[PDB]
Write an enzyme that holds these catalytic residues in place. Structure first.
Site, PDB file in Angstrom:
ATOM      1  N   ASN A  33      -1.114  52.109  68.257  1.00  0.00           N
ATOM      2  CA  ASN A  33      -0.356  52.617  67.476  1.00  0.00           C
ATOM      3  C   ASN A  33      -0.284  54.212  67.722  1.00  0.00           C
ATOM      4  O   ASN A  33      -1.520  54.759  67.967  1.00  0.00           O
ATOM      5  CB  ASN A  33      -0.706  52.245  65.750  1.00  0.00           C
ATOM      6  N   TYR A 101      15.384  53.309  72.357  1.00  0.00           N
ATOM      7  CA  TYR A 101      16.799  53.790  72.943  1.00  0.00           C
ATOM      8  C   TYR A 101      16.998  55.149  73.510  1.00  0.00           C
ATOM      9  O   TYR A 101      17.944  55.668  73.986  1.00  0.00           O
ATOM     10  CB  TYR A 101      18.068  53.444  72.227  1.00  0.00           C
ATOM     11  N   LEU A 195      27.534  60.297  73.714  1.00  0.00           N
ATOM     12  CA  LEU A 195      27.534  59.443  72.676  1.00  0.00           C
ATOM     13  C   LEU A 195      26.780  59.983  71.641  1.00  0.00           C
ATOM     14  O   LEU A 195      25.370  60.343  71.927  1.00  0.00           O
ATOM     15  CB  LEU A 195      27.023  58.152  73.005  1.00  0.00           C
ATOM     16  N   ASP A 200      24.017  62.964  77.583  1.00  0.00           N
ATOM     17  CA  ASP A 200      24.739  61.999  78.637  1.00  0.00           C
ATOM     18  C   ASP A 200      24.303  62.168  80.186  1.00  0.00           C
ATOM     19  O   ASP A 200      24.551  63.134  80.687  1.00  0.00           O
ATOM     20  CB  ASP A 200      26.340  61.985  78.508  1.00  0.00           C
ATOM     21  N   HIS A 234      30.600  53.345  77.486  1.00  0.00           N
ATOM     22  CA  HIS A 234      30.136  54.942  77.696  1.00  0.00           C
ATOM     23  C   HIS A 234      29.948  55.308  78.970  1.00  0.00           C
ATOM     24  O   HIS A 234      29.516  56.270  79.470  1.00  0.00           O
ATOM     25  CB  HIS A 234      29.266  55.260  76.789  1.00  0.00           C
ATOM     26  N   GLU A 258      26.601  45.547  76.235  1.00  0.00           N
ATOM     27  CA  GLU A 258      26.971  45.905  75.010  1.00  0.00           C
ATOM     28  C   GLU A 258      28.226  46.847  75.069  1.00  0.00           C
ATOM     29  O   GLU A 258      28.148  48.034  75.243  1.00  0.00           O
ATOM     30  CB  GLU A 258      26.077  46.676  74.102  1.00  0.00           C
ATOM     31  N   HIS A 328      20.857  44.789  65.431  1.00  0.00           N
ATOM     32  CA  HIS A 328      20.344  45.892  64.778  1.00  0.00           C
ATOM     33  C   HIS A 328      21.099  47.087  64.305  1.00  0.00           C
ATOM     34  O   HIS A 328      20.974  48.145  63.750  1.00  0.00           O
ATOM     35  CB  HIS A 328      19.293  46.229  65.881  1.00  0.00           C
ATOM     36  N   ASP A 329      22.697  46.975  64.906  1.00  0.00           N
ATOM     37  CA  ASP A 329      23.454  48.110  64.202  1.00  0.00           C
ATOM     38  C   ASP A 329      24.453  47.469  63.275  1.00  0.00           C
ATOM     39  O   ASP A 329      25.388  48.240  63.065  1.00  0.00           O
ATOM     40  CB  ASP A 329      24.371  48.291  65.730  1.00  0.00           C
ATOM     41  N   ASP A 371      21.928  50.608  59.323  1.00  0.00           N
ATOM     42  CA  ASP A 371      20.683  51.024  60.248  1.00  0.00           C
ATOM     43  C   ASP A 371      20.144  52.142  59.266  1.00  0.00           C
ATOM     44  O   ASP A 371      20.730  53.087  59.020  1.00  0.00           O
ATOM     45  CB  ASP A 371      21.286  51.745  61.744  1.00  0.00           C
ATOM     46  N   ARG A 375      16.448  46.739  60.003  1.00  0.00           N
ATOM     47  CA  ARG A 375      15.414  47.009  60.817  1.00  0.00           C
ATOM     48  C   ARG A 375      13.987  46.874  60.097  1.00  0.00           C
ATOM     49  O   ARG A 375      12.990  47.285  60.674  1.00  0.00           O
ATOM     50  CB  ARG A 375      15.628  48.020  61.890  1.00  0.00           C
TER      51      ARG A 375
HETATM   52 CA   LIG Z   1       0.452  48.441  67.667  1.00  0.00          CA
HETATM   53 CA   LIG Z   2      28.465  58.245  79.445  1.00  0.00          CA
END
Ligand SMILES: [Ca+2]
Ligand SMILES: [Ca+2]
Ligand SMILES: OC[C@H]1O[C@H](O[C@H]2[C@H](O)[C@@H](O)[C@@H](O)O[C@@H]2CO)[C@H](O)[C@@H](O)[C@@H]1O
Ligand SMILES: [Cl-]
Length: 683
Positions: A33, A101, A195, A200, A234, A258, A328-329, A371, A375
């Site tokens: 963690n 991400y 984005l 980018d 993108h 995606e 998740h979005d 979001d 989540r």
């Molecule tokens: Ca953990």
């Molecule tokens: Ca791009």
């Protein structure tokens, strides 16, 4: 090995994917963690690391939670090292890379999820239990950055196995784009601008192209079974086709991008991408329609059927569409009130064409709109919920019934609230009836089916109020009542099969590579596989799967058919793309190309990758705003390495085509690195 085996990693149509948000699933090891502001042990501050990790996923594989549900694949967030900075957030206090991400090093792991040894343990544990593992991978960007404020976050800094390449500020190497941020107003705008505030990546830079290719190979060598590619709207189509070829040439795996689409959104670039990139797509047309029909009450079953028919028409590889009802979005599908709608949306997805994906916690009726509320930490592992058991009963049918994995879809009965549809693959059939109305029943008369004569029990065993039907020799179904909220599933699996192809993967290949043909009725003795009319070399042969080496046919698209040893011929599986050679991304630039209103510049040339002079399939319309400005046009294009190409530019609108005069332009494509070729328009 059969088509259904865990080792068949180019076909997911017989699988059901469970999408896990690693940090928010199970904390299997506390010692890994984060400490300090990165970490929230209370699991309440929704943009912090909660501590979920790969060991936690391992635990839920070993203890039977996932297998007991009939999950046969998992999709996990990007496994690569992410930024450590805690970004200010006025609502949540701080915002972190818990979601995976915000990459800082695509060649190393996120130590909070685990080490490479933990990742190896996850791959191996999954495989021991017949579960395939898909990783998210996000080569569009590194992480949040400000060029004017390098102190913000980690300034998008990128490392190559610990060695700093550079950051967003003082980007002397040109590793990133410096064109501001996208407003999603055009395809070009969304590709070359940032984005949000994400730095980018410039994939046209040879160092970056080579880096990303090397990075994905690290993960392929870790034994991944699939890739979900982030934000594919993108990045340039040309670059991604080039990237896909690198993957498929090394070790092919099922890859799906995606490409986000909103409710009712039309995007011809999305169709082209699915048909030409060498990868599949998340099915946002399917998902958004299912939400309209079952969740938000803004379309009817007619709309649902219209989506089924339109998607089938548009997409060449409908069995590769990765379907889902949320993620998740998106707002969590369950939104309060009756749980029947989400149960029905699950049943629909699990029995419909493509590759179903289920977001973690759907089976526990988790709620959360937006979001990061969508989540939350996994709430429960209760195996008695109706939704858990809907999945348990229906998921295995994709393995046992080839009509569900591979079959066509035909409407058999429809009104505003009722959809009865049939999946068919040879003599294998599944018939599914759904009544979304939670207060009103319908009298079902005039129903026909391809099910053989007899009485059929509901596969769900009445879990969703289903019941039996009786079918006559002419296919007529005895009238029955479809009760409020009812779902029923009826099926027939034939004891024998004529040769039938349900899937071919990969769909983008070249001479000497191996493709996998899946279906039924191929027989046990080796026969023939034809690319058009040209035979390939058989690698292996079984009744449900044939592997074959690609012959040296003229590069282009080919329809695949199979002949058994006794001479029975299969259906054709169309549009398998045979490339000219290994791919390279080349930026084509043309100067002084003036056009009238509504007229655009396109590229054509003498290899399959440029359409072999077919103006109706010329590359474009080309771009002319961001990297270069009109009347200079540009486009990034996947072309065969080391090949001397001839090409010209054309202008077209809606009526009439103007070609460059003079002799063709010529250029030899680089052997390994990206290239740029710049020419002047010839009158
Ligand atoms: Ca953990
Ligand atoms: Ca791009
Ligand atoms: O009987 C053949 C007929 O069956 C289905 O039609 C249904 C229709 O969908 C319902 O809305 C209602 O009108 O009952 C009909 C059956 O009497 C199929 O949809 C249709 O294609 C088919 O011809
Ligand atoms: Cl549609």
């Amino acid at each position: 090995a059969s088509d259904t085996a865990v080792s068949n990693v180019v076909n997911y149509s017989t699988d059901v994917i469970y999408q896990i948000v690693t940090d928010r699933f199970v904390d299997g090891n506390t010692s890994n963690n984060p400490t300090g502001d990165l970490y929230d042990p209370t699991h309440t501050s929704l943009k912090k690391y909660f501590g979920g990790d790969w060991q936690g996923i391992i635990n839920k594989i070993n203890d039977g939670y996932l297998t007991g549900m009939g999950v046969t694949a998992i999709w996990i967030p990007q496994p690569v090292e992410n930024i450590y900075a805690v970004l200010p957030d006025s609502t949540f206090g701080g915002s972190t890379s818990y979601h995976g991400y915000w990459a800082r090093d695509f060649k190393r792991t996120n130590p909070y999820f685990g080490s490479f040894t933990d990742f190896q343990n996850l791959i191996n544990t999954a495989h021991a239990h017949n579960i395939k593992v898909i990783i998210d991978f996000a080569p569009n960007h590194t992480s949040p950055a400000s060029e004017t404020d390098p102190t913000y976050a980690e300034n998008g800094r990128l490392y190559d196995n610990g060695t700093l390449l550079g950051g967003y500020t003082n980007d002397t190497n040109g590793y990133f784009h410096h064109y501001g941020g996208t407003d999603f107003s055009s395809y070009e705008d969304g590709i070359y601008r940032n984005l949000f505030d994400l730095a980018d990546l410039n994939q046209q830079n040879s160092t970056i192209d080579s880096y990303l290719k090397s990075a994905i190979k690290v993960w392929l060598d870790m034994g991944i079974d699939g890739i979900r590619l982030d934000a594919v709207k993108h990045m340039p189509f040309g670059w991604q086709k080039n990237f896909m070829d690198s993957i498929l040439s090394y070790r092919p795996v099922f890859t799906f991008g995606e490409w986000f689409l909103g409710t009712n959104e039309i995007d011809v670039n999305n169709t082209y991408f699915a048909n030409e990139s060498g990868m599949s797509l998340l099915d946002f047309r399917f998902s958004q329609k299912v939400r309209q029909v079952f969740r938000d009450n803004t379309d009817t079953m007619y709309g649902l059927d219209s989506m089924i028919q339109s998607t089938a028409s548009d997409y060449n590889f409908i069995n590769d569409m990765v379907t889902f009802i949320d993620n998740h979005d998106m707002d969590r599908f369950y939104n309060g009130g009756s749980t029947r709608p989400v149960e029905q949306a699950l049943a629909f997805t699990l029995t419909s064409r493509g590759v179903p994906a289920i977001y973690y916690g759907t089976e526990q009726y988790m709620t959360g709109n937006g979001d990061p509320y969508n989540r939350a930490m996994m709430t429960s592992f209760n195996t008695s919920t109706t939704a858990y058991n809907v999945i348990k009963k229906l998921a295995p049918l994709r393995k046992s019934n080839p009509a569900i994995a591979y079959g066509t879809t035909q409407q058999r009965w429809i009104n505003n609230d009722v959809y009865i549809y049939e999946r068919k693959f040879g003599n294998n059939v599944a018939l599914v009836a759904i009544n979304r109305n939670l207060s009103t029943s319908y009298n079902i008369t005039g129903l026909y089916t391809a099910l053989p004569a007899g009485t059929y029990t509901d596969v769900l065993g009445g879990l969703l109020n289903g019941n039996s039907i009786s079918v006559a020799s002419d296919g007529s179904v005895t009238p029955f009542t479809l009760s409020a909220g009812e779902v029923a599933v009826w099926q027939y699996v034939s004891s024998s099969n004529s040769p039938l192809i349900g899937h071919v993967g990969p769909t983008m290949t070249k001479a000497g590579q191996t493709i996998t043909i899946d279906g039924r009725g191929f027989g046990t003795t080796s026969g023939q596989v034809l690319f058009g009319s040209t035979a390939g070399t058989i690698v292996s042969w079984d009744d449900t799967e044939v592997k074959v080496k690609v012959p040296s046919v003229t590069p282009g698209k080919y329809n695949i058919s199979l002949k058994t040893s006794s001479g029975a011929t299969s259906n054709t599986y169309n549009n398998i793309n045979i490339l000219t050679g290994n791919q390279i991304c080349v930026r084509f630039v043309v100067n002084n190309a003036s056009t009238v209103y509504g007229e655009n510049v396109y590229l054509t040339g003498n290899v399959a990758e440029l359409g072999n002079w077919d103006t109706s399939k010329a590359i474009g319309p080309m771009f002319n705003q961001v990297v270069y400005q009109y009347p200079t046009w540009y486009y990034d294009v996947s072309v065969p390495a080391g090949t001397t190409i001839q090409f010209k530019f054309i202008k077209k609108n809606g009526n009439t085509i103007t070609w460059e005069g003079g002799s063709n332009h010529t250029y030899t494509v680089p052997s390994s690195s990206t290239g740029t070729v710049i020419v002047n328009w010839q009158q």
